[PDB]
Design a binder for this molecule. Structure first.
Ligand SMILES: Nc1ncnc2c1ncn2[C@@H]1O[C@H](COP(=O)(O)OP(=O)(O)OP(O)(O)=S)[C@@H](O)[C@H]1O
Ligand SMILES: Nc1ncnc2c1ncn2[C@@H]1O[C@H](COP(=O)(O)OP(=O)(O)OP(O)(O)=S)[C@@H](O)[C@H]1O
Ligand SMILES: Nc1ncnc2c1ncn2[C@@H]1O[C@H](COP(=O)(O)OP(=O)(O)OP(O)(O)=S)[C@@H](O)[C@H]1O
Ligand SMILES: [K+]
Ligand SMILES: [K+]
Ligand SMILES: [K+]
Ligand SMILES: [Mg+2]
Ligand SMILES: [Mg+2]
Ligand SMILES: [Mg+2]
Lengths: 525, 525, 525
């Protein structure tokens, strides 16, 4: 269709207008005094929310060029969401502040490529400096503290997460399930988690976690690409009869076969979800086998001349529960016998002795850790169904934050970390004056989150910013009580991982828009 | 003609909009970093100015209700200008701050009369307090200091003003004239100043001072009202022949006769200006006579059966110079002989002995002081015509500030004095909640001048206001260097009188607008 | 009338667009390859010109705000023009370049007052540095050279100007008149020049020089202000009878009397021109007397009780010729006898011995030099009336440039001097970053004149600018021949005084525009 094409400044003003509608809608919800945003729904009451990502999803604009700007900067929240699971609003605030000053510098005649280089240099140094401020979260006391804080001061949840991490290691797999009664339970089951997510968003049966959850499912382990539905028919009907759901772990599920699984789990017919097998090449087969051993299944590979047509319910593996994210599959309580599994471990453990290369060694150690480690299962107890679904959600969130904390530690919240970082970089310089302006654009942007939190309180950003900057270390502003003090002592912490992601994705998308010269869109027609 | 009529809120929003355009245009010029305002002129290059009064005179708005709010608030500046001859921009900023928050309170349902009452109570107490803060300017050291500081640190100008005040008293008449050569000259001549201005603005031959200036003019002293030009004709033509200008001092110059004088000095035909005779009733005649004795003229009064037709050049008085303002006439160097004047002084001095009432005594003492006081003439020396017109202007301005200082003392400049006054009134309460709101409106408005000074620097008004409020006394912000310090030691002082006037005029017009319910104007038609 | 009022950015974009129309019209005519501009006239053929001033005078714009920006910047050309008499196009190109980048720096958020401070600092340093580069023009060889070059390589004209300067000194008075025949004549007559111009442009009888020229006039020397025509009547009629013109040298000629002289020399009735008397105060009377002595006239002062009514043709002085500019009066060949004049000289020369102050000494030496120095008269010979008016024009222009060269010397033309000065200032810094951007603005603008000369040639500005920047000293681009070389050896010189004026008036009006926050004009109605 015929296009509308815009260049330079014409395009920049449209982009900036769109980013501003998006960011301005989102940013009112930042921090403890965030304001509500009302989102219209086609039936019944509108949604009232303080959640950045809910607002951003609804933003689409009529002017097509403004719309492109909103959708580009929206990619900042979702990327920060996917990498750290928090900080999408902080990321949008940082993005609008960089884009705004960046595009003003461009309109003033400064070189967009230098501006970007300066932003990137500041970001690179800011991130090193964030790591140097990060306070580690390594012992179970620290873990329990963070978990307590993330669970709205519920010391129970903190103890639980610390206990789970103590059983499987802070890098171990932990899930949470509904409790059976009043008290919390923590057990370790045979299980495993690997880095593959669902092959279509449609398999998601729980939009609240954006996840796929299956109970007592059969697991098809196919060592090949599935293109034809034909191959599946006999196994699918056999599973239909036992009344259980099916997890397909294949080398891949492509077009035709996937499209059918999507349409057929959509009409309730059979509950099937498909993920890619972990790894690639040689180690892929070995790993498929690890899963087989764990779930008591049998790898159906074309190398031994086995067909999917000639596969019964006995070939399929089984587990009590499987959960799959955008990019994770976790298999909880596999049927595989302790004999077979422990025997498999001993095999791999010997491969480690015969390994003639570090690379092969690490790859093997990873397999053993997954196979011998199992999965911690937190079962959340409560008095009623309602209190339970609620406590479960708190445990899930608290776990998520604590995990982030364990990885890269914690830094002062309320946007003080980025403010301290920016002041350590006052002397940072680049190769020329435009790069220097770029550096300053990014240092200035780093105050935006603190300023917006203050603004949402009804206080003066410039006064609070200036006061915070005039102290040091963990001194900042507690926006819930409206007092200054030590952020760590007050329990206002951000996982370093979230702060670092929000900054990095903000600067990344911003540097793409600051170096955009031309925009192409359909004619409004 | 048909009227448009608005009430309540509809009226309030129009008034506020009008005030805002006027105040916004004027306030950019405030203080050392005031910005330029460009004023269009129908011929040649526009006027570029940093002077509030120049801006304010040009403002007139299309919408007739908005225009009414601009013109009501302009009354602030012009009355502060008439009373204290400085501070009109400060006055305009205080007025906008009061009006803005007062009208918001009204829109919120608070009682306008209580708001006004609260504002008024605050202003009353603020003015007592500004007198307590005020530092006297009474001795000739102080007067030289203030003069020096108002002359851009020119100690020469400070010495001259102190010398002139030492000759004629700090309440005596002082003028400045062009020097004859390189050095300054101070002499005392016979002369007098009285509280009557021109009878039409059209006599103004020097729009730069808004004044009327006449050189070696004849002075007609007529003890009656002049309605007919007929009477004047014979005296007017006799004056026309001598080639000198004429000052008419009559009991009044009404309609017909005035209209003619206006038209005839307009076409350059004869240079004539008219003022009312000073005082009223009995003392008016005796005062007319004092002027006569001073200028060597003869009172033409109808009580002795004298006509204006039978008056020659010999009857008229004379002086080297007369200057007339909106509400002052000053006669410089009258021809009257020292014998006659000194003899008249002695007469009045005896009347003071015979006086049987305080009131008659004081009135008589006033006359003697004027007749015996003379007029100090400062002649400004310089190397070139350009340097002299410049140094003359500095002396004029310094003289004007010093006079104000001598009446009411001096306080910290840079808006600090009103901030110190506000903070002392934090506990001030009225009869009810609305009145308390009124008080707060006024105390908040008292910050506005410091804030606007700061904003014109390009700095952050809330940060500086916060810092200055955290200090005390004379601590404040020097907007020329951008440093904090002691306002007095840094030489940044305002005459108390100008601070007081700005505030009282601002509050006065703001209270009228806040209690306005209805506006009537012509239909745009 | 009702006003339109604009603020900030809305004002800045209007200003800028009006400056661009004006400067774009003017700048095409810069340099040896300047292009033609066609100016409509209401009757007959349009005017075709390469003269910037001519273009500027016609520029008026419909949008009242853009018109204000044109009229402001036109003040640059006319102030350069009054101070130096050349360089107005250069000055307009410098202003456009400073305003353009200065308003873009404001739009980007930079503090206008700091921007202006930076520009002023660069200009102040640039001017010092121009002085350091200036090659003197002090001996008569250099004077002849510069004369020759300013006269389109006419060595004749150069010799003449050098001979005239040799007779009366390089600071002496020199005029040019029509020759009587074929050869040039140079003689020295009794005469004098003083710093007072005409009191109205209407006395101009020669619009080609914008000058007033009077032949064998009477000279009224009145030591007082003339307000009334009455006083003049008897002297005016006495002059009317002798059939000669009259020059009025009074303390001033104000409103009424001036308006009449304007109207009466306008209808051909009597040829009268009026100028202020030189100096002020005491030395004014002494100086009035010097003129009297020179012209054989008699001072009519009111201090000795003399009237203008009682003045005959015998009281008036006389001279063969007088010429009056916007700000100069020159009296050529006064009738005064050598006895009286030489005797007056001896008097003053004694005052110099008795002088007890340097100031009084210099003032006296100035009077002797004027009275004893006379006036060099260049009479231009030619073969026909046409060739003579033409040669006379060349001599006038050459003289004017040579005089400018003698005061402050000469620098490389072609915009090279400013480019050399800009590169010496690369390290110049101010108090903050916005001041530094200011400095850069001004250094970038200093390339504009060379780049616009180049652009007028149809060559590439950046290539030429870069090549000139890469050499040094007087290396530049000869835009007549399109070759690089040594600008001084090629004879492409600018008087330092014109380059300095152009740059200072440009920066001065540009700094006012940059710090303009608000504009007020009549509603288009
Ligand atoms: N008492 C507090 N005082 C100041 N800041 C706080 C306080 N409590 C939490 N915060 C800060 O609030 C910010 C988090 O606000 P949120 O509203 O969750 O937005 P976000 O995490 O940036 O984006 P979402 O949640 O993905 S939408 C973090 O910087 C916290 O440090
Ligand atoms: N260095 C300074 N720092 C802060 N304030 C100053 C400084 N110098 C003068 N001022 C203040 O600036 C204010 C005077 O500003 P102006 O521009 O004259 O306007 P104004 O008197 O209120 O109104 P005008 O002159 O009639 S228009 C006073 O409050 C001074 O004390
Ligand atoms: N051959 C040349 N090559 C380069 N520049 C030259 C040459 N001859 C003269 N110029 C320069 O041209 C500039 C002057 O051009 P003009 O057109 O007179 O403009 P202006 O003097 O800037 O403005 P006017 O005359 O008052 S309109 C000076 O910079 C001269 O040095
Ligand atoms: K939120
Ligand atoms: K001002
Ligand atoms: K030209
Ligand atoms: Mg969050
Ligand atoms: Mg003032
Ligand atoms: Mg020229």
């Amino acid at each position: 269709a015929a296009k509308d094409v815009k260049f330079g400044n014409d395009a920049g003003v449209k982009m900036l207008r769109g980013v501003n509608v998006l960011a301005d809608a989102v940013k009112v919800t930042l921090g403890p005094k965030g304001r509500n945003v009302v989102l219209d729904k086609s039936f019944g009451a509108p949604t009232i929310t303080k959640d950045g990502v809910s607002v951003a999803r609804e933003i689409e604009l009529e002017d097509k060029f403004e719309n492109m700007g909103a959708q580009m900067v929206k990619e900042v929240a979702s990327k920060a969401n996917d990498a750290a699971g928090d900080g999408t609003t902080t990321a949008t605030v940082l993005a609008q502040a960089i884009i705004t000053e960046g595009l003003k510098a461009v309109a003033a005649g400064m070189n967009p490529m230098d501006l970007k280089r300066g932003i990137d240099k500041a970001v690179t140094v800011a991130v090193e400096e964030l790591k140097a401020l990060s306070v580690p979260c390594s012992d179970s006391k620290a873990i329990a503290q963070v978990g307590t804080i993330s669970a709205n001061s519920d010391e129970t949840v903190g103890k639980l997460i610390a206990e789970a991490m103590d059983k499987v290691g802070k890098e171990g797999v932990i899930t949470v399930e509904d409790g059976t009664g009043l008290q919390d339970e923590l057990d370790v089951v045979e299980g495993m988690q690997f880095d593959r997510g669902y092959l279509s968003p449609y398999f998601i049966n729980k939009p609240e976690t954006g996840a796929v959850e299956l109970e007592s499912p059969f697991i098809l382990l196919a060592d090949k690409k599935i293109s034809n539905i034909r191959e599946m028919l006999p196994v699918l009907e056999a599973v239909a009869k036992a009344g259980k759901p099916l997890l397909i772990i294949a080398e891949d599920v492509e077009g035709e076969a996937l499209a059918t699984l999507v349409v057929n789990t959509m009409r309730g017919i059979v509950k099937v979800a498909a993920v890619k097998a972990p790894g690639f090449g040689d180690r892929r087969k070995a790993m498929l086998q690890d899963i087989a051993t764990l779930t008591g299944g049998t790898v159906i590979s074309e190398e031994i001349g086995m067909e999917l047509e000639k596969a019964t319910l006995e070939d399929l593996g089984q587990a009590k529960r499987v959960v799959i994210n955008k990019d994770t599959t976790t298999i909880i309580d596999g049927v595989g016998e302790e004999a077979a599994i422990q025997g498999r471990v001993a095999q791999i453990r010997q491969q480690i002795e015969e390994a003639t290369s570090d690379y092969d060694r690490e790859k093997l150690q990873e397999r053993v850790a997954k196979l011998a480690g199992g999965v911690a299962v937190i079962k959340v107890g409560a008095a009623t169904e309602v209190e339970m679904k609620e406590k479960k959600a708190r445990v899930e969130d608290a776990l998520h934050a604590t995990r982030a904390a364990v990885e890269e530690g914690v830094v002062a919240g309320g946007g003080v970390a980025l403010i301290r970082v920016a002041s350590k970089l006052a002397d940072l310089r680049g190769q020329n004056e435009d790069q220097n302006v770029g550096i300053k654009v990014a240092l200035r942007a780093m105050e935006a989150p603190l300023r917006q939190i203050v603004l949402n309180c009804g206080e003066e950003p410039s006064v609070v910013a200036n006061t915070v900057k005039g102290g040091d270390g963990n001194y900042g502003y507690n926006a819930a009580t409206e007092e200054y003090g030590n952020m760590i002592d007050m329990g206002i912490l951000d996982p370093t991982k979230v702060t670092r992601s929000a900054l990095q994705y903000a600067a990344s998308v911003a540097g793409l828009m600051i170096t955009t010269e031309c925009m192409v869109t359909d004619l409004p027609k």
